[PDB]
Write a protein that binds this ligand. Structure first.
Ligand SMILES: Nc1ncnc2c1ncn2[C@@H]1O[C@H](COP(=O)(O)OP(=O)(O)OP(=O)(O)O)[C@@H](O)[C@H]1O
Ligand SMILES: Nc1ncnc2c1ncn2[C@@H]1O[C@H](COP(=O)(O)OP(=O)(O)OP(=O)(O)O)[C@@H](O)[C@H]1O
Ligand SMILES: Nc1ncnc2c1ncn2[C@@H]1O[C@H](COP(=O)(O)OP(=O)(O)OP(=O)(O)O)[C@@H](O)[C@H]1O
Ligand SMILES: Nc1ncnc2c1ncn2[C@@H]1O[C@H](COP(=O)(O)OP(=O)(O)OP(=O)(O)O)[C@@H](O)[C@H]1O
Ligand SMILES: Nc1ncnc2c1ncn2[C@@H]1O[C@H](COP(=O)(O)OP(=O)(O)OP(=O)(O)O)[C@@H](O)[C@H]1O
Ligand SMILES: Nc1ncnc2c1ncn2[C@@H]1O[C@H](COP(=O)(O)OP(=O)(O)OP(=O)(O)O)[C@@H](O)[C@H]1O
Ligand SMILES: Nc1ncnc2c1ncn2[C@@H]1O[C@H](COP(=O)(O)OP(=O)(O)OP(=O)(O)O)[C@@H](O)[C@H]1O
Ligand SMILES: Nc1ncnc2c1ncn2[C@@H]1O[C@H](COP(=O)(O)OP(=O)(O)OP(=O)(O)O)[C@@H](O)[C@H]1O
Ligand SMILES: [Mg+2]
Ligand SMILES: [Mg+2]
Ligand SMILES: [Mg+2]
Ligand SMILES: [Mg+2]
Ligand SMILES: [Mg+2]
Ligand SMILES: [Mg+2]
Ligand SMILES: [Mg+2]
Ligand SMILES: [Mg+2]
Lengths: 304, 308, 304, 308
């Protein structure tokens, strides 16, 4: 089986905290935070670990927050390959409000990356063996030009590194610019922004996904549709997998869990069907990241 | 195409209002309300009217609010069979917050019904000819014992009135207790309450729905699943229809719209799949806009065509 | 002692309801409402009742909601003089959210008043004896031209009816246009809108209040300042009364309770000091409408 | 004018961020934060710097966040005496919601302190000369026993350091347990917790404050009352100063600003009234703007002049 790496240009050390009520103006007294590994690629690696696989998380780490992030992944036995960054690893805030049961997620940009540190990350990426899979997942941190993302992906694929992209906005277009992307998982609004139009008609998602495949931009597009599952599109196939009529109770980690599952399936040369079903199983398992047991249970139902 | 009727024991005349912000304590200055017809059966009839069908909405109407409700249904060419009620038609509040684009819905009980007023309503129902469809939809208002609703449905079925139920809690359980319900559309929470257990496993919804049809409570159970569409269950079929990948902007009127659509399909003797697909199309059509426009004929047609 | 009347051109039958949580989109299941008398002048009359006085609430009442409003005031032994209105008495919504303890107040306009019904109300007002006090309190309902408000107040004062105004926006200016208003109680933002400028400097409130007095627009201006009490201004005096360092737990009914207390004091030919102290006592009592005991306790402290 | 110092055992480097809307579940996309200095003593020193005074902020600083905190204080010409801490200076989050104009403040504990780091901090404190003022303000961080704070204040007072306290809960109670505190500024809730009873009656705040001074815990108690200003209490005087009728836009930094101002007035040997009036002026000056600008010299001067 082929090795899996992920790349998080904008990782975080997230603080999970609890407060009784949420209201403006007042000081909301929040419990001592529980630190959580943040960032697309990082969480893809974690989801892959949960699913019985192994993925090395490549990412910039700065300062004591970066160290803690590294340490958290070490304790989850997630292999890591870091680049030391000048700017300290930033912290997002996850607040659970006791009275309402609601969670609030304050998502700030990753720490800045200077040009040197990005080349250092590129260096790390280029050390990945041919045929190995790289998941580039998450936002683009300040300091990184969009063209550099494109350049990294070009450079990666020019070495037979099979690239999986999960991003948004200008970063998603940039990552997809050189084309020949193994797999891209936009959600609906990411697909909409990518293709640069509102997706209002029933077939708009499919057509946008097929366009991307057709233009050679991505070999596979999996448009994730939240509770509606995902629509996977190949040069050969177009499928929608919808999760079982269950829950959901949270959405946190849904995308990354799905991407991790699909990445494993990609690594295993699974079919589009298997890949998307497993993606939907893991994403949906996360909504109850994904546990192995929950994913397997959803996956068995989807495959029944 | 048989005659279709709806019954709304707890209608309302809803106020839709706009306010710049939402926050506690202070007076939220709300715009002069736009009145909207409220109640399950009423909106089922409205949804049917939108879809080019005709359903007569049966309901109690009380006071100027009742009068305006009837007037709103008039304007929409929705046929009506009202019984005048002593207690004024109550008002729910729909608040659109400008700053956030969010809508709040404050749902209070319908007005009380006398025993006489319910008797009149049952009467109206029992004037429905054999073979015609009655959609009983909405909450049970104060003043009505559960047994009266069960008795009403028994009497209706006794004279060949085909009954479709959309309700919750004790009213739903009461309505299904009679059995031989043509169609019930619980959403997931309602199915869970009805079957009296959490639906946590992938096949729980299906089995719960199959349980209801196997018991004879309902011939057809369409468990509506919000964005996940609906799972329709027969004695012979279990079909899930998921709406197309269009993001909803609202959920107001989704359930009633779906029921209206499936009622039409039932009346047309559509297959379960056709019925559920049209239900999903109409329900999801409703989600395309904020407000209470429900499903439009065109949006429903477009979505149904896609689902087909 | 002189008779007190109030005028509510925009009364309401308010629904007080409870719901566990507040969130958008979902149906918030609300308990069967408890009906409450709504409207400035009406609540001034109620506050006056609570304070051992009597005030007749003049207002348009339409339909079964109007009847219920009348019936609620009957049960509170508030004298009433109604005009039957074509348009049914409108309903505001007060939602208590259990989880947060917060109350939400959705305040829509009063029912429409046609021109005939307003003259009918004017007729009622003009039946008030000379020297009696009329509190015109609340919003202006649809259908009433601002000039008609001015006209009513002119007509009232032309008969020796002593007019107390509590309103906002264009209605407050209109009510104050003929001048010689006995008492006006703007809050800060009402004062700001009335005088048509932001009140940003420490002395702005006082100066705006003194301007109104000086221009002969009102004999007395009491600018209510929420937790800061009120600044009362005469042609002779300028005082600030601030409530004791207590609570508060709600603000509902604060203004009307204050106006009712000050109206009683006006009726009793109390001093500016006594009037404002009693106003602040009642307004602040309401924040714990005002009860007699709470008002007396705050008033004793203020007078100590 | 004696030397002024502040002690912040739990500082923070706060992130101020903007997001268009606030709602649960979804990712709220927040702008690149603007970093702000957090912690009671730190902001007391900042407020003093704003008012044209100088106070040296003593605090633990850990990591790049600690470094940036120190750097933020540098930029503001706020003298600093830091002890390097192993645990990185923690971050609170201030979120401005564009749609509503509302600000949310998420306050988490300060970083942990070693016994060594606290010893260094006590050391820094005990290098303060007799007669100088120390303002101990803020929460007690993890790793510090209450007794250590009490011991610190005892040692400080032992060598004639004049101690001003602004804290809550056990830390406040601990800080006052020593007694002979020059000035404490509980707000109403803090006074209530401290005196261990509800303040519901008109004279409760006054009596509670008088109780604290009469017990010798504090020479001066200024109960701050938010928009109601403050009630300052001496062995000889009870004076309430209410701010002018200017509506506040924010409450961030009100309490620290007030403390800074009163610390200055204390240092200048002002009367209780002068001190409380200047406290109120600065505290209310702070409320005029959103953000963490605290009180400006000009706004405080304007308000103080009015209150005078
Ligand atoms: N000074 C103030 N001015 C206006 N409103 C206030 C003030 N203090 C508190 N509030 C209101 O009460 C709510 C709860 O505030 P709380 O009593 O917790 O005060 P705080 O300033 O957050 O905390 P602390 O007690 O630590 O000062 C706030 O959200 C705010 O709306
Ligand atoms: N509400 C839900 N109910 C059930 N399953 C869900 C829900 N939301 C997400 N999932 C599962 O997770 C997968 C990925 O989630 P989604 O389509 O929301 O992607 P995403 O927006 O990229 O996620 P994220 O916000 O974590 O980045 C879905 O295809 C589905 O299998
Ligand atoms: N008297 C008061 N005491 C405490 N807080 C208040 C007071 N008045 C207003 N507020 C605060 O300001 C916000 C908006 O209130 P606003 O200024 O609109 O006053 P209001 O009492 O709702 O309306 P009005 O101006 O009609 O009296 C509310 O969220 C509330 O927390
Ligand atoms: N978020 C959504 N996105 C797309 N379609 C939706 C969404 N919500 C509802 N629908 C459509 O509406 C149908 C009925 O909605 P739902 O399952 O929520 O029923 P319901 O809860 O009874 O509705 P209501 O709350 O109006 O009573 C669904 O099966 C689906 O076709
Ligand atoms: N069809 C739906 N589509 C999207 N979100 C939904 C849907 N139904 C419910 N929700 C979400 O769950 C929250 C709680 O909704 P709830 O389960 O009470 O459904 P409802 O439509 O309000 O009531 P009912 O159960 O009577 O249909 C809503 O505020 C909404 O955010
Ligand atoms: N938060 C509070 N704490 C203590 N007392 C208050 C508070 N709010 C109001 N009061 C008392 O009520 C009086 C009137 O309230 P306020 O100044 O808010 O008038 P208002 O805005 O017209 O009231 P309303 O919003 O009810 O119309 C005040 O002068 C004061 O005595
Ligand atoms: N997968 C999902 N399942 C259920 N609700 C969702 C899902 N994704 C988004 N929502 C709803 O839509 C609102 C905004 O979410 P948004 O569309 O920004 O997705 P997100 O997951 O936060 O961000 P992203 O687009 O980065 O994945 C939230 O309040 C949430 O209730
Ligand atoms: N809403 C307000 N309006 C006017 N002035 C205010 C307001 N809130 C606070 N102040 C001023 O700030 C001073 C200190 O504020 P407050 O009494 O709220 O202390 P605090 O709760 O300790 O502050 P913080 O929450 O910053 O710790 C007050 O005495 C007053 O002068
Ligand atoms: Mg995603
Ligand atoms: Mg998402
Ligand atoms: Mg429903
Ligand atoms: Mg629903
Ligand atoms: Mg008022
Ligand atoms: Mg007010
Ligand atoms: Mg404080
Ligand atoms: Mg405070």
């Amino acid at each position: 089986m082929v090795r899996i790496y992920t790349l998080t240009l904008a990782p975080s050390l997230d603080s999970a905290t609890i407060t009784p009520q949420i209201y403006p103006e007042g000081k909301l007294r929040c419990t001592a935070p529980v630190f959580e590994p943040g960032g697309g690629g990082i969480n893809v690696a974690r989801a892959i670990a949960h699913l019985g696989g192994s993925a090395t998380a490549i990412f910039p780490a700065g300062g004591a927050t970066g160290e803690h992030l590294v340490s958290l992944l070490a304790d989850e036995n997630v292999p890591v390959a870091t680049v030391e960054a000048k700017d300290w690893t930033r912290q997002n805030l996850h607040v659970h409000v006791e009275a309402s049961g609601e969670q609030y997620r304050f998502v700030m940009p990753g720490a800045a990356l200077n040009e040197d540190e990005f080349r250092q990350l590129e260096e790390q990426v280029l050390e990945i063996e041919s045929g190995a899979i790289l998941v580039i997942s998450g936002s683009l941190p300040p300091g990184v030009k969009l063209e550099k993302l494109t350049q990294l992906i070009s450079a990666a694929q020019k070495q037979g590194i099979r690239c999986i992209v999960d991003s948004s906005g200008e970063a998603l277009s940039a990552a997809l610019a050189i084309g020949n992307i193994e797999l891209v998982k936009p959600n609906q609004k990411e697909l909409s922004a990518l293709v640069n139009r509102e997706l209002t008609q029933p077939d708009d998602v499919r057509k946008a996904a097929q366009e991307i495949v057709n233009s050679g931009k991505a070999k596979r597009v999996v448009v994730s549709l939240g509770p509606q599952g995902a629509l996977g599109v190949d040069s050969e196939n177009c499928i929608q997998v919808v999760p079982p009529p269950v829950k959901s109770q949270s959405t946190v980690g849904a995308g990354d869990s799905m991407v991790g599952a699909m990445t494993l399936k990609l690594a295993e040369n699974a079919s589009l069907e298997e890949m998307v079903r497993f993606g939907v199983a893991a994403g949906s398992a996360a909504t109850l990241l994904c546990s192995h047991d929950d994913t397997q249970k959803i996956y068995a139902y989807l495959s029944r």
